[PDB]
Amino acid sequence: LFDENYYAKAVANIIGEVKDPIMYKWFSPDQIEDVDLQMGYQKTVKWDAFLNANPTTIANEVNTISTIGFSSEVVRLNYLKLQYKFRHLKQTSEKFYTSDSYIGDINNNLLPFAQAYKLASSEIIKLINHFVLTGTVSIQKDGKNQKRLLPNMYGLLNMPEQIKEEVASGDKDKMDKIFEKIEAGLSKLELGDEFSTPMMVIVDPATSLKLVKPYACEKWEDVLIQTIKAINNREDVYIETSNLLKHKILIYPLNSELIKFKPSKYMLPTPNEQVDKDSTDVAHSYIDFVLGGLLATRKTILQVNIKQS
Amino acid sequence: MELFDENYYAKAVANIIGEVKDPIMYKWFSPDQIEDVDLQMGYQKTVKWDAFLNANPTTIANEVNTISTIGFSSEVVRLNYLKLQYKFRHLKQTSEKFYTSDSYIGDINNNLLPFAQAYKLASSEIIKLINHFVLTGTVSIQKDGKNQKRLLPNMYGLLNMPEQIKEEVASGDKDKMDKIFEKIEAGLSKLELGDEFSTPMMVIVDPATSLKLVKPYACEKWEDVLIQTIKAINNREDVYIETSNLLKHKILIYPLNSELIKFKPSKYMLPTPNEQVDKDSTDVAHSYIDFVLGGLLATRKTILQVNIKQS
Amino acid sequence: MELFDENYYAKAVANIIGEVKDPIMYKWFSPDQIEDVDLQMGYQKTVKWDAFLNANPTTIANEVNTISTIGFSSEVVRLNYLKLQYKFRHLKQTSEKFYTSDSYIGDINNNLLPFAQAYKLASSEIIKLINHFVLTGTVSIQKDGKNQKRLLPNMYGLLNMPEQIKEEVASGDKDKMDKIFEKIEAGLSKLELGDEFSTPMMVIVDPATSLKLVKPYACEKWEDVLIQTIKAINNREDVYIETSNLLKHKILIYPLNSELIKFKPSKYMLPTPNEQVDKDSTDVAHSYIDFVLGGLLATRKTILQVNIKQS
């Protein structure tokens, strides 16, 4: 194939220079499991057993024994396929633009296929990270003009049937009120028998700045860590900051039995076979990716929104 | 429900069965404290041998034949073991080719599963029940804790072991960590470890107690003060703190020493399949699982149990 | 539909794609009446000569130099062959993995099929159209027969071949087999086979005509009477009867002799795939099928068409 198709060879040679997505830091290694899918949905069935009554004592003769029942639950996760197009130089014409220092036309912003693919892949990876963190697809700093997505396609912030706390605009700068809301949410958390798990917290830069203030010689960060350790069986608590969030605090456990990320094996950017060609030196290429695949147990995620108005 | 062929888009099927994991009760005992016994039902008697000095030693000088003596003593303890069984339905082995596709394991409509999956789920549930019994000493399947199964005498858990230290926090002081810590100090003072005090200690608390503990001490924490207090008496060795949802307004403190507390479970305590399998002309079969309860042994006045009365 | 998992009970699935079959027009001709020609689009021309009498013969008495003449004429017989092409959509080859499973051959929701199945179905449809053209002589996709494609001259079928014998049975006497057979006898008498009369004959009728024929004659049947009548003119040679659902209230009679009726179809007349394949970044591709029309040649007053008017 590499003897016939130059673009595949170039992609293979340059694919090692693409940085890993930062979303991997929001999950544990056991929480992520790939699936073989491009577009459609995946049905996940969870099987459970329950005890009908007290166990029966085996003494003398007996024929009536207590039973153990079974139940099933079906979960449907939607996956969507998306594509992007980009223009680049032609392989047979690169030699006419291979300058001593670089390759390409600065005047016309025309790049070699390898560099163009690397940059496009990095941008698409950033977009995927934003979708995974937020659950919405947008390219504006305001977050509007969102692309409409299918149902059962949720992120960490817009997952339904979770715990939602809202801090009023009057208390927007009161860390005591924010921590009171956090305590209420943590109390409402329901981790059941899986409470012995590490916890992950994601905060916006403003909240990160507010956390390092002295506690009203202790810090609000330390108080929050102790409060979360009070419920996670005193195990690890991790704190992360993301510029993609705005006055949002996310708390969730890193347990594969409660939250699972089952992305498609083609989720990350992948080149497409079709290449547009003409008589000029400009050619176009396509990159495909897949979105969707977050599953969470009901009432296991705490989302705090600090209203600004 | 979609009116088009949505089953066409079901291009991936993942089935969550879980796995039989190690019981959580192992975290409450040291490796040396657990010793299996060969029994299924009845009682077993264990004899502890003991020695003592009758007088001061004798100086071996010149000729002498009247020497001091060393005496011996024995104590007999009887432990009861109970056998219990559960029954579950499953698909017959020959019907799997008809009731199992590549995207299916069993009847989703009728909740019918093959033997392996059904046995694994039942084993997990029974292991959870065994852990509850070991921690509490009672058998129940209700969150209220009522409808308890009546058990044999000499069958106790950590919480309900007799001849141990029991402290009660009044309902008027149910939210006073100072009063709770005063009661804990009284219990620790009443603890009697003898020459085995140089041992690690284990504390088990409920989530509400943990929430109260992580509060600042009235920059120190109630948990740190409790750890220091326990280290004052355990020769400053390891003190472990654990939280369990099976407890409610209870605090358990005990040492991890085999010389004081031991666990001698039956070698069939964990779930075991039975040989009898019910079969008929249909495709549904039934199977049985056995498990054995009992075997906790403790010395007198070596466990502190604090109960915070709610009303 | 069902409110439970009805898909669980779909143990096996079957897909009917059919198979490309031979055209039914082969049954309408003898093996020696068909000869392929190598021409995709164009014409084939032949020259034929004829003579005729201008006036009465001249009596040669005494002296005369003004004599009646015998005239001659030439005719150019031209056959036009026309190329046509259709386009169809299908799945891209590298997308069948994601758009096809063991329970689905294609996308049922959007009616999108793999290349092989789509080509087979399209070829079947095109062969049906070719058979309709060969029988009727017109190309249309409407039951009314309107919006016909404008074809080149000298592109006729058996039914629309000009200068042949046509009989019309009135609407009132549609049920009267005696009147129908009277019209058939009139046409058969008007038939002109010349020296090639000793040849097998072929009759094509509609099912209603067959039902009317299998009635007793006003023992012996109307079919037997018709066969004997046709034998009387074809020198008691084979007379074949075929029923075709394509015709409606039409009876076609013609000899199976290569000297009177000939078929010279293009060797590329039957459907053939095209090399061009349309591809894009999506998972849908397009392909093309080519076929050639034209090539039926016949003598005058050798094809009899009886039409039973319904109004």
How many contacts does A have with C, using Cβ atoms within 8 A? 12
The one-letter amino acid code at A229 reads K
Provide, as residue numbers in chain A, all residues whose Cβ is less than 8 Å from the Cβ of C94: 273
Provide, as residue numbers in chain B, all residues whose Cβ is less than 8 Å from the Cβ of A72: 108, 111
Kindly determine whether residue B86 and residue A51, on different chains, have CB atoms separated by under 8 Å: yes
In terms of Cα–Cα distance, which of A209, A290, A304, A295 is closest to A255? A295
Q: Check if the beta carbon of residue B112 is closer than 8 Å to that of residue B100.
A: no
Angle at C28 between CA C209 and CA C83, to 5 degrees: 120
Exposure of B28 by Cβ count < 10 A (0-12 exposed, 13-18 middle, 19+ buried)? buried
Query: Long-range contacts for C63-67 (Cβ within 8 Å, ≥24 apart)?
Result: none
If you count them, how many residues does chain C have? 311
Q: Check if the beta carbon of residue B261 is closer than 8 Å to that of residue B303.
A: yes
Nearest-neighbour CA in chain A from C281: distance (Å):
6
Kindly determine whether residue B4 and residue C107, on different chains, have CB atoms separated by under 8 Å: no
Angle at A258 between CA A252 and CA A260, to 5 degrees: 90
For A186, A231, A237, A302, the CA distances from A189, given in Å and listed in that order, are 5, 9, 16, 7
Q: Check if the beta carbon of residue C91 is closer than 8 Å to that of residue C99.
A: yes
For A253, A256, B10, B14, B244, the CA distances from A297, given in Å and listed in that order, are 11, 10, 21, 16, 21
Kindly determine whether residue B9 and residue A53, on different chains, have CB atoms separated by under 8 Å: no
Q: Check if the beta carbon of residue C100 is closer than 8 Å to that of residue C270.
A: no
Q: Check if the beta carbon of residue C66 is closer than 8 Å to that of residue C259.
A: no
Hey, is A210 helix, strand or coil? helix
Q: Check if the beta carbon of residue B30 is closer than 8 Å to that of residue B200.
A: yes
CA separation for the pair C158, C244 (Å, rounded)? 14
Q: Check if the beta carbon of residue B118 is closer than 8 Å to that of residue B287.
A: yes
CA separation for the pair C95, A103 (Å, rounded)? 35
Hey, is A290 helix, strand or coil? strand
Of B1, B5, B104, the CB nearest to C108: B5
CA end-to-end span of chain B: 50
**Tokens standing for residue C83:** 């190329």
For A106, A117, A235, the CA distances from A224, given in Å and listed in that order, are 51, 43, 13
Chain A residue whose CA is closest to B7: A41
Angle at C208 between CA C206 and CA C212, to 5 degrees: 115
Of A37, A74, A274, the CB nearest to C281: A274
CA separation for the pair C200, C14 (Å, rounded)? 45
Q: Count of CB atoms within 10 A of residue A167's CB?
A: 22
- CA quadruple C218, C221, C222, C224: dihedral positive or negative? negative
Q: What are phi and psi of B156, to 5 degrees?
A: -130, 155
Kindly determine whether residue B109 and residue C5, on different chains, have CB atoms separated by under 8 Å: yes
Q: Give residues after which chain B gaps, C-N over 2.5 angstroms.
A: 218
The one-letter amino acid code at C256 reads L
- CA quadruple B218, B223, B226, B232: dihedral positive or negative? negative
Kindly determine whether residue A39 and residue C98, on different chains, have CB atoms separated by under 8 Å: yes
Provide, as residue numbers in chain A, all residues whose Cβ is less than 8 Å from the Cβ of C5: 74
- What's the gap between Cα A267 and its chain centre? 12
Q: Check if the beta carbon of residue A235 is closer than 8 Å to that of residue A229.
A: yes
Q: Give residues after which chain A gaps, C-N over 2.5 angstroms.
A: 216
Provide, as residue numbers in chain B, all residues whose Cβ is less than 8 Å from the Cβ of A230: 207, 210-211, 213-214
- What's the gap between Cα B61 and its chain centre? 56
Q: Check if the beta carbon of residue C177 is closer than 8 Å to that of residue C185.
A: no
Q: Check if the beta carbon of residue C186 is closer than 8 Å to that of residue C253.
A: no
Provide, as residue numbers in chain A, all residues whose Cβ is less than 8 Å from the Cβ of B207: 195, 230-231
Angle at C228 between CA C227 and CA C232, to 5 degrees: 120
Q: Directed axis angle between helix A220-229 and helix A175-188, to 10°?
A: 10
Q: Count of CB atoms within 10 A of residue B66's CB?
A: 5
Find the helix or strand (DSSP H, E) in which B296 lies.
strand B296-298
Q: Count of CB atoms within 10 A of residue B140's CB?
A: 16
Nearest-neighbour CA in chain B from A50: distance (Å):
7
Q: Check if the beta carbon of residue C86 is closer than 8 Å to that of residue C289.
A: yes
Chain B residue whose CA is closest to A68: B88
Chain C residue whose CA is closest to A83: C281
Of A37, A38, A286, the CB nearest to C281: A286
Of B14, B125, B242, the CB nearest to A49: B125
DSSP B300: T
Q: Tell me how the structure was determined.
A: cryo-EM
Provide, as residue numbers in chain B, all residues whose Cβ is less than 8 Å from the Cβ of C104: 8
Kindly determine whether residue C109 and residue B8, on different chains, have CB atoms separated by under 8 Å: yes
Q: Count of CB atoms within 10 A of residue C219's CB?
A: 5
Provide, as residue numbers in chain B, all residues whose Cβ is less than 8 Å from the Cβ of A71: 111
The bridge status of strand B165-169 relative to strand B304-308 is parallel
**Tokens standing for residue A309:** 């108005």
- Residue of A84, A85, A274 to mutate for C, most C C-beta atoms under 10 A: A274
Nearest-neighbour CA in chain B from C95: distance (Å):
14
CA separation for the pair A69, A90 (Å, rounded)? 65
Provide, as residue numbers in chain C, all residues whose Cβ is less than 8 Å from the Cβ of B102: 102
CA separation for the pair B259, B245 (Å, rounded)? 29
Q: What are phi and psi of C259, to 5 degrees?
A: -75, -20
| Residue B67 neighbours by CB under 8 Å, 6+ apart | B58
For B171, B209, B222, B228, the CA distances from B175, given in Å and listed in that order, are 8, 10, 13, 22
In terms of Cα–Cα distance, which of B83, B210, B204, B208 is closest to B139? B83
Of A37, A39, A274, the CB nearest to C280: A274
Phi-psi region of B140 (alpha: psi -120 to 50; beta: other; left: phi over 0): beta
**Tokens standing for residue C48:** 């034929």
In terms of Cα–Cα distance, which of B64, B119, B113, B107 is closest to B91? B113
Q: What are phi and psi of A14, to 5 degrees?
A: -100, -10
Q: Check if the beta carbon of residue A277 is closer than 8 Å to that of residue C279.
A: no
- Residue of C2, C5, C8 to mutate for B, most B C-beta atoms under 10 A: C8
* Residue reference for tokens 């190598």: C38
Resolution (A): 3.3
CA separation for the pair B132, B149 (Å, rounded)? 13
Hey, is C107 helix, strand or coil? strand
CA separation for the pair B238, C199 (Å, rounded)? 116
DSSP string, C79-91: EEEEEEEEEEEEE
Kindly determine whether residue A57 and residue B83, on different chains, have CB atoms separated by under 8 Å: yes
Provide, as residue numbers in chain A, all residues whose Cβ is less than 8 Å from the Cβ of C98: 37-39
Q: What are phi and psi of C284, to 5 degrees?
A: -120, 130
Cα-trace Rg, chain B? 26
Of B82, B111, B125, the CB nearest to A72: B111
Q: Check if the beta carbon of residue C267 is closer than 8 Å to that of residue C37.
A: yes
CA separation for the pair A117, A91 (Å, rounded)? 14
CA end-to-end span of chain A: 59
CA separation for the pair A173, A209 (Å, rounded)? 11
- Residue of B1, B8, B13 to mutate for C, most C C-beta atoms under 10 A: B8
Chain B residue whose CA is closest to C102: B102
DSSP string, B255-289: E--TTTEEE--BTT-S-EEEEEEE--SSSEEEEEE
Nearest-neighbour CA in chain B from C9: distance (Å):
9
CA separation for the pair B24, B28 (Å, rounded)? 8
CA separation for the pair A38, C65 (Å, rounded)? 99
Provide, as residue numbers in chain B, all residues whose Cβ is less than 8 Å from the Cβ of C1: 1, 3
Q: How many CA atoms lie within 13 A of A149 on its CB side?
A: 25
Kindly determine whether residue B109 and residue C1, on different chains, have CB atoms separated by under 8 Å: no
